[PDB]
Design a protein around this ligand. Structure first.
Ligand SMILES: Cc1cc(N2CC[C@@](C#N)(C3CC3)C2=O)cc(NC(=O)Cc2ccccc2)n1
Ligand SMILES: Cc1cc(N2CC[C@@](C#N)(C3CC3)C2=O)cc(NC(=O)Cc2ccccc2)n1
Ligand code: PRO
Ligand code: PRO
Lengths: 487, 487
């Protein structure tokens, strides 16, 4: 009975995951499949990254707005997601006069009105962002945080007078996403360009951040930044009069990150005692647990712990003193380890008379004795050191998951050691499907598809030797590409 | 042509309103009726009040969460909004296996899972809040901000071990709503209790803040705080084991405020030059406009204005220097008056050599000469004074809209001078419909209904004389009640 996780992360990944997100109180399941309740501990992470991203995109002059949840068939025909689109058809027990659709993304909704806001070069750039939810009602297997039917995200859309400005903003955003994942979630990502078979519909190109879950060998797209060029401008007639009084199409970007980031964080840092949180996204940085070794007095210990609590709160470090008289210290240790609190301070009589206390890190369980008036400083530093540790332990694990190959015969082996492969590729779009269908075929060897897809063409390219040929088709290769199984 | 408003507020209210919200760039209309785009200037107000409310409800230990947008028929039967509920019935061109509903409110969605979170008195109180959007797909006439089919709001839900705690939280929330409207929107409200015909379905009682628009004589409900008692607990089986090991029902509250607050603010402070913003919800507190009286040099004036801009930004007062070479100073004055900026600073050559500048308040258009090194301080104070002025001018207008009456014969007259009436009332629910139907009948005398409804029973009650009888039914009266036309 007790608590904790009954599956080990390295042995039954999927069940370890569902156990962790339910018992850490991040998530509640719901009676519609693919929909989940975000309880306060998870919503707090989202609020944290929201504050960071809002502050960074105000420096780029992006402004927040809110657009409607619904779109008409009329405006949806200008883009001619068709099966992922949910249709509202009645109110109460009577039918609507015209059925309407719930947004899977806000391109058509927003660009239906862009033309009245953009008429001349004086109106550019236009830079909008929304924090909202979208609905993609697919019938594949959902995964909490990772792939859901309704999810929270941010979506930004910009319009510029030329291509250079737009592309610069695309890559500025992509580095903001790098920081979102590193400075707050302590998660390393790889920047790259999607192949033509995988880019956003209507984009000129799609840039992307990719993460990897090494325990089950799967890549996950972490965020995207599309250069749309003038494609949507042509569809929606977003013209402006330039400084030579010539009509031009705007050059557009759109970009998005979702609550999938939370999932990625859990899958990277979680362990067999459960959740591990980077301090910057944990509401409580410290939990103080008292220990009464049948002590002659509770109240010296109560007094001491609340002294430590006010030391910590005066310096704006939010913490909690678990003084519940009903539970034992061991119960409390596990209760807060499962909920991911980064630092635990224990005081017993032994520590009280040495004017000391025990500090325990949640990441490596290393315990340290520290004098009372030293605790604040040693807490601050150690919070910092926890982040770096999490990050670098994840960074190493990312680096050691990429096997460089030059022929298809090396590929299946690497996939079955739970790796991605970096391979020379001709980038012809037909080969994408072929590679998918062959890797799946040779996967006869755990609920998700064995196909390997192109994940991204890394921005950091290794040199392409002179006559190096494509690992799949034998044609002359153009670039190095990442392939792997994904979510 | 030019710009501005072609209708005066006191003569064609509804058209003045639509002109103001479109031309101040608060709102864009959409091709689905009753749905509106919140452009950045309006969304900024919402973000402001969001920050205030988040900080205040964290002091009450309310925690933010996110629940799904959809509910099943199954969970919707436990509450047996039926016509306001939109039904999703297909994805793409295929039908869903079971149709699902979009939330008009989250009671049934959240309380379907409350029972697994509340099992014992140790689990109470439970305090949740959501920032989200809801859909009420009615076929009455929509009004931007005021009554829409999709709107943004906050909804809080709490569960307590007894009635006293729950009721205390109800009225704590109601005073937070009072502060939201006063300290940020500079809008006075009246606190009261809804009559039994107007309270939330399933509530024990509904407390409410009401506002009044004196230019067209209409009350608007500004926010609500419901004491649900154990009604929803009985429906959803939210039981807990108390400290005497007896099974008890939780006592619940729910409470909400929407973007209707923005509308109320516009209707209170707007004038014939357009929008008037309280500084605390304006992104730009100050706009600096340069004036070149055919000056021998632009650049002394450019230098001076940017000096003033850095004085203002160093002290964290966000402002904008309108240096567009194309437009005249008069154009710029109207451009920023229409957009509601509270303070305008003008510099011409005359002012530059006196080392002075002109400060103009947006509320009363009063202009004042001020020395350069004095500007910061005189800006700060004047921002403050603008708020109080707006508030008290609105407060007076609220007070002078209530006529106290004792018989029905006085009522129609007061309604036609655009007043509310405070009347002695027996509070029998039947009379509600009767009073509605009679006032509408006698309204033959501008697109909205002439019926007068009970708005609220004020918390601030005048004394009820000994044998005072109900103004409608002649029965002995119980309390004083506000009645009027509403939105
Ligand atoms: C939670 C989450 C996230 C995301 N996506 C999309 C790509 C992206 C990135 N990068 C967004 C564009 C920015 C991302 O995170 C997508 C999703 N659901 C789905 O696709 C639908 C679905 C539902 C159930 C099963 C299978 C599929 N669910
Ligand atoms: C913008 C906004 C606000 C609010 N409501 C509700 C009461 C409340 C208060 N207090 C909320 C509970 C807190 C409020 O603000 C309600 C609405 N639409 C509607 O009723 C539906 C509708 C749509 C078109 C025409 C006529 C009616 N639209
Ligand atoms: O869904 C996507 O991938 C793009 C980026 C956000 C809006 N549309
Ligand atoms: O809609 C209402 O009036 C209540 C308060 C927020 C949730 N339900």
């Amino acid at each position: 009975g007790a608590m904790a996780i009954t599956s080990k992360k390295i042995e039954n990944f999927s069940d370890w995951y569902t156990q962790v997100i339910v018992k850490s109180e991040l998530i509640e399941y719901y009676d519609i499949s693919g929909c989940y309740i975000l309880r306060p501990a998870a919503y707090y992470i989202w609020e944290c990254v929201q504050a960071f991203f809002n502050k960074e995109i105000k420096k780029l002059n992006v402004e927040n707005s809110y657009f409607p949840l619904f779109v008409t068939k009329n405006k949806l025909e200008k883009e001619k997601f068709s099966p992922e689109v949910a249709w509202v058809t009645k109110y109460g027990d009577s039918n609507l006069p015209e059925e309407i659709a719930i947004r899977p993304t806000s391109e058509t909704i927003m660009y239906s009105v862009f033309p009245k806001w953009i008429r001349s070069y004086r109106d550019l750039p236009l830079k909008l962002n929304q924090w909202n939810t979208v609905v993609r009602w697919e019938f594949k297997q959902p995964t909490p945080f990772i792939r859901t039917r309704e999810f929270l995200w941010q979506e930004g859309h910009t319009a510029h007078k030329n291509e250079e400005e737009a592309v610069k903003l695309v890559f500025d955003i992509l580095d903001l996403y790098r920081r979102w994942y590193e400075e707050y979630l302590a998660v390393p990502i790889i920047k790259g360009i999607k192949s033509e078979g995988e880019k956003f519909g209507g984009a000129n190109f799609t840039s992307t951040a990719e993460a990897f879950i090494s325990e089950n060998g799967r890549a996950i797209q972490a965020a995207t930044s599309h250069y749309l060029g003038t494609n949507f401008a042509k569809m929606f007639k977003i013209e402006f009069e330039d400084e030579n009084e010539v009509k031009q199409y705007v050059h557009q970007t759109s970009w998005g990150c979702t609550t999938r980031s939370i999932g990625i964080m859990i899958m990277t840092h979680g362990d067999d005692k459960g959740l591990v949180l980077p301090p910057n996204v944990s509401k409580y940085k410290v939990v103080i647990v008292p220990i009464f070794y049948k002590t002659t007095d509770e109240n010296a210990i109560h007094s001491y712990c609340k002294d430590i609590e006010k030391i910590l709160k005066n310096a704006q470090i939010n913490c909690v003193y678990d003084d519940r008289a009903s539970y034992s210290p061991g119960y409390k240790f596990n209760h807060w380890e499962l909920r991911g609190i980064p630092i635990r301070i224990e005081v017993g009589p032994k520590d009280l008379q040495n004017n000391s206390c025990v500090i325990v890190r949640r990441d490596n369980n290393e315990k340290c004795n520290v004098k009372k008036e030293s605790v604040l400083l040693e807490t601050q530093q150690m919070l910092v050191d926890i982040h770096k540790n999490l990050f670098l332990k994840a960074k190493k694990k990312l680096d050691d998951s990429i096997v460089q190959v030059t022929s298809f015969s090396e590929v299946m082996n690497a996939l079955n050691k739970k790796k991605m492969v970096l391979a020379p590729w001709c980038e012809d779009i037909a080969t994408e499907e072929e590679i998918k269908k062959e890797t799946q075929r040779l996967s006869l060897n755990t609920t998700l598809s064995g196909a390997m897809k192109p994940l991204c063409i890394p921005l950091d390219q290794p040199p392409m030797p002179p006559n190096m040929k494509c690992f799949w088709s034998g044609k002359p290769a153009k670039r190095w590409c990442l392939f792997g199984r994904s979510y």
